[PDB]
Amino acid sequence: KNIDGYFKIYSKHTPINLVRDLPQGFSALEPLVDLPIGINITRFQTLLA
Amino acid sequence: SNNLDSKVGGNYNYLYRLFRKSNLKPFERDISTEIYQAGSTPCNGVEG
């Protein structure tokens, strides 16, 4: 998310055992880094190996 | 800063936005040089 130009990042890493669709459970995301960039974002793209 | 910024007839390094379509959000920077169009006639990048 972006708040007055501040881009907030939250991350979470937990093991899972899934085949398809989604898992059933609960989780919380911890702060990772704060990026005071200040650029408006209207689109995003994904990068895969 | 008159003793420093002022230079002869003017200083082009300092510029301001005279017109804007709407009100920019706080701490928002937009350096777009698009011509301001107040009517429905396209400006085509030239004053008029």
Curated annotation (Swiss-Prot), chain A:
It comes from the Viruses. Glycans are attached at N40. Attaches the virion to the cell membrane by interacting with host receptor, initiating the infection. The major receptor is host ACE2. When S2/S2' has been cleaved, binding to the receptor triggers direct fusion at the cell membrane. When S2/S2' has not been cleaved, binding to the receptor results in internalization of the virus by endocytosis using host TFRC and GRM2 and leading to fusion of the virion membrane with the host endosomal membrane. Alternatively, may use NRP1/NRP2 and integrin as entry receptors. Binds to host ACE2. RBD also interacts with the N-linked glycan on 'Asn-90' of ACE2. Cleavage of S generates a polybasic C-terminal sequence on S1 that binds to host Neuropilin-1 (NRP1) and Neuropilin-2 (NRP2) receptors. Interacts with host integrin alpha-5/beta-1 (ITGA5:ITGB1) and with ACE2 in complex with integrin alpha-5/beta-1 (ITGA5:ITGB1). May interact via cytoplasmic c-terminus with M protein. May interact (via N-terminus) with host bilirubin and biliverdin, thereby preventing antibody binding to the SARS-CoV-2 spike NTD via an allosteric mechanism. This is Spike protein S1. The chain holds residues 195 to 243 of 1273 of the full protein.
UniProtKB/Swiss-Prot annotation, chain B:
It comes from Severe acute respiratory syndrome coronavirus 2. Changing N23K: In strain: Omicron/BA.2.75, Omicron/BQ.1.1, Omicron/XBB.1.5, Omicron/EG.5.1. Changing E47Q: In strain: Kappa/B.1.617.1. Changing K7T: In strain: Omicron/BQ.1.1. Changing G9S: In strain: Omicron/BA.1, Omicron/BA.2.75, Omicron/XBB.1.5, Omicron/EG.5.1. Changing V46A: Increased resistance to neutralizing antibodies. Changing F19L: In strain: Omicron/EG.5.1. This is Spike protein S1. The lineage of its organism: Viruses, Riboviria, Orthornavirae, Pisuviricota, Pisoniviricetes.
